[PDB]
Design a binder for these strands. Structure first.
Ligand code: CTP
Ligand code: CA
Length: 425
DNA sequence: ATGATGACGCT
DNA sequence: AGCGTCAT
C-alpha cells in the first residue's frame, strides 16, 4: 500500500514529426502545401514506392509502401515528390539534415534521446522542477495549453470545444499548492512541450505531435492519440480505462512475435487484462526480463531511461535488389559495393568533421535470393581508412566465399554496409 | 518488388 | 561474433 511504487517519478515526452518527409518537401516546394501529396522513392517500377503521405492524401486511402501508380488509382490528383537518387540509390540526406534542425531546437529545452529520423524522447523532470519554482504557486491557465488533450477527459459539439472541456476539467481539479503532485508535474511538462513545439514550428516550419506522460511507452502511446499537430497528456490515473480496450500490439515492443504470443498463450486481447496475472506467471511464459516488464507496464509503470543520445551509434548504407534485378555476376556485386561505399564514405567524412569521431569496424550484410530474412549473412572487418575503394574491396573479400560459383550464385537481393564502433577523434 | 536505416537482445 | 527482433 504505502510501499507500492506508482511509476510517477519522471516527466517524459515523445515528439513525433507529422508526415515528416512530406513536410520537408512542402516547405521546399510551396505548390505542394495543403494538397494531397506523397514522397516516393525510385520511379521506374510502378511509379515508385510511397514512403510518406500527407494527411489530405491519407483521406483517400493512400498509404506507405503502396506503389505510386496504385496510389493514383485512389487519388488521381495526388502530387508527388521524389527522393533524391545518388549512385543508383535513394539518398535521404535532405531529411536527415531537416531532422538535425528539429533535434537541435529540442536540445535547447532538455536532454533528448533520438528514437528515429523524426522522433525524440525528452526527459523533462528537471525542467518541470525549475519551472514549478518560477511559477510560484500561480495557477496554470488554459491559454498555456492551446493544443493539449487530456486523455480520458471530458467525463461525466465540435472537436475543439471538447478538447477545451476536457482541459478545463483537468485544470479545475489540479492541486497547484503541491509541488510533488505527479499530475501537476505532467501539466507543467505539457506547458514546456507546447513551448518546444511552438519553437520547432517557428524556426523550421514543421509541425509535430507529442505525448507527455511518466515514461517512454506511455508518452509514445499518448503522442499517437491526437495526430496531427496536437499533444496529449496521459496521466497515471488515466491508465486503467485507456488500457482496458487498448490492443496489446499497440504498446511499443509488443507489435511483433512477443505481443502475438502474449495474446495466444494468455488468451487476452487488451493491455489491461495483463493485470490479472502474477509477476511469476508472466516470467514463466515470457522470461524473467519480459515478465517483470509486462507486470509493471500493464499498470502504467516502466523504468527505461531517456538515454542522452542525439547521434546514431552506427552509420549504414543499404540497397535491395528484388526480383530479376538480383545481382548475379561478380562485377555487379563489386560495382554496387563500390556505389554503397562511396555514399558511406561521404556520410562518414561529414560525421567525422561534424561530431569528432571515427568508426573502427565495417559490417557487411547480404541477403540471398529466396531468403525471407532481412539479412542472410553478416561479417565484419577493420575500418581503418575512410576510402570507398578500400571499404568495397574489404567488403568483397569478407563475403567472397559465400559465392557458390564470373558469376555469383545464388544472386544477392540485398547489400548492406554499416560503419560501427565509433571512437572519439 | 517496399525501402532505408537503426537499436538492442541472445548466444 | 553472428543472428534474431522490433522499430520509424
Ligand atoms: N515502415 C517504415 C516506417 C517509417 N520509416 C521511416 O520513418 C519515417 C517517419 O515515419 P513515421 O513517423 O511512421 O511516418 P510519418 O510520415 O512521419 O507520418 P506520421 O504523421 O504518422 O508520423 C519515414 O519517412 C521513413 O523514413 C520507414 O522507413 N519504414
Ligand atoms: Ca512521424
Amino acid at each position: 500500500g504505502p510501499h507500492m511504487a506508482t511509476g510517477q517519478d519522471r516527466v517524459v515526452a515523445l515528439v513525433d514529426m507529422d508526415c515528416f518527409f512530406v513536410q520537408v518537401e512542402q516547405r521546399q516546394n510551396p505548390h505542394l502545401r495543403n494538397k494531397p501529396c506523397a514522397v516516393v522513392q525510385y520511379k521506374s517500377w510502378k511509379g515508385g514506392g510511397i514512403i510518406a503521405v500527407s494527411y489530405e492524401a491519407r483521406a483517400f486511402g493512400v498509404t506507405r509502401s503502396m506503389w505510386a501508380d496504385d496510389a493514383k488509382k485512389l487519388c488521381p490528383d495526388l502530387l508527388l515528390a521524389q527522393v533524391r537518387e545518388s549512385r543508383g540509390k535513394a539518398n535521404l540526406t535532405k531529411y536527415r539534415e531537416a531532422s538535425v534542425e528539429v533535434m537541435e531546437i529540442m536540445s535547447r529545452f532538455a536532454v533528448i534521446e533520438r528514437a528515429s529520423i523524426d522522433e525524440a524522447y525528452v526527459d523533462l523532470t528537471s525542467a518541470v522542477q525549475e519551472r514549478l519554482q518560477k511559477l510560484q504557486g500561480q495557477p496554470i491557465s488554459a491559454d498555456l495549453l492551446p493544443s493539449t488533450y487530456i486523455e480520458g477527459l471530458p467525463q461525466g459539439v465540435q472537436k475543439e470545444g471538447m478538447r477545451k472541456q476536457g482541459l478545463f476539467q483537468w485544470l479545475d481539479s489540479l492541486q497547484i499548492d503541491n509541488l510533488t503532485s505527479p499530475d501537476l508535474q505532467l501539466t507543467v511538462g505539457a506547458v514546456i512541450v507546447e513551448e518546444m513545439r511552438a519553437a520547432i514550428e517557428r524556426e523550421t516550419g514543421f509541425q509535430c505531435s507529442a505525448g507527455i506522460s511518466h515514461n517512454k511507452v506511455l508518452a509514445k502511446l499518448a503522442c499517437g492519440l491526437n495526430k496531427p499537430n496536437r499533444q496529449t497528456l496521459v496521466s497515471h490515473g488515466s491508465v486503467p480505462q485507456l488500457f482496458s480496450q487498448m490492443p496489446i500490439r499497440k504498446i511499443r515492443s509488443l507489435g511483433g512475435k512477443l505481443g502475438a504470443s502474449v495474446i495466444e498463450i494468455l488468451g487476452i486481447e487488451y493491455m489491461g487484462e495483463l493485470t490479472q496475472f502474477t509477476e511469476s506467471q508472466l516470467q514463466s511464459h515470457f522470461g524473467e526480463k519480459n515478465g517483470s516488464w509486462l507486470y509493471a507496464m500493464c499498470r502504467g509503470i516502466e523504468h527505461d531511461p531517456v538515454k542522452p543520445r542525439q547521434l546514431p551509434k552506427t552509420i549504414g548504407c543499404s540497397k535491395n535488389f528484388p526480383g530479376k534485378t538480383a545481382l548475379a555476376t561478380r562485377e555487379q556485386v563489386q560495382w554496387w559495393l563500390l556505389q554503397l561505399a562511396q555514399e558511406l564514405e561521404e556520410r562518414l567524412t561529414k560525421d567525422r568533421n561534424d561530431n569528432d569521431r571515427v568508426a573502427t569496424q565495417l559490417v557487411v550484410s547480404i541477403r540471398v535470393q529466396g531468403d525471407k530474412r532481412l539479412s542472410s549473412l553478416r561479417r565484419c572487418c577493420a575500418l581503418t581508412r575512410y576510402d570507398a575503394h578500400k571499404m568495397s574491396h574489404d567488403a568483397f573479400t569478407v563475403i567472397k566465399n559465400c559465392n557458390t560459383s564470373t558469376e555469383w550464385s545464388p544472386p544477392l537481393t540485398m547489400l548492406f554496409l554499416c560503419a560501427t564502433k565509433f571512437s572519439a577523434s
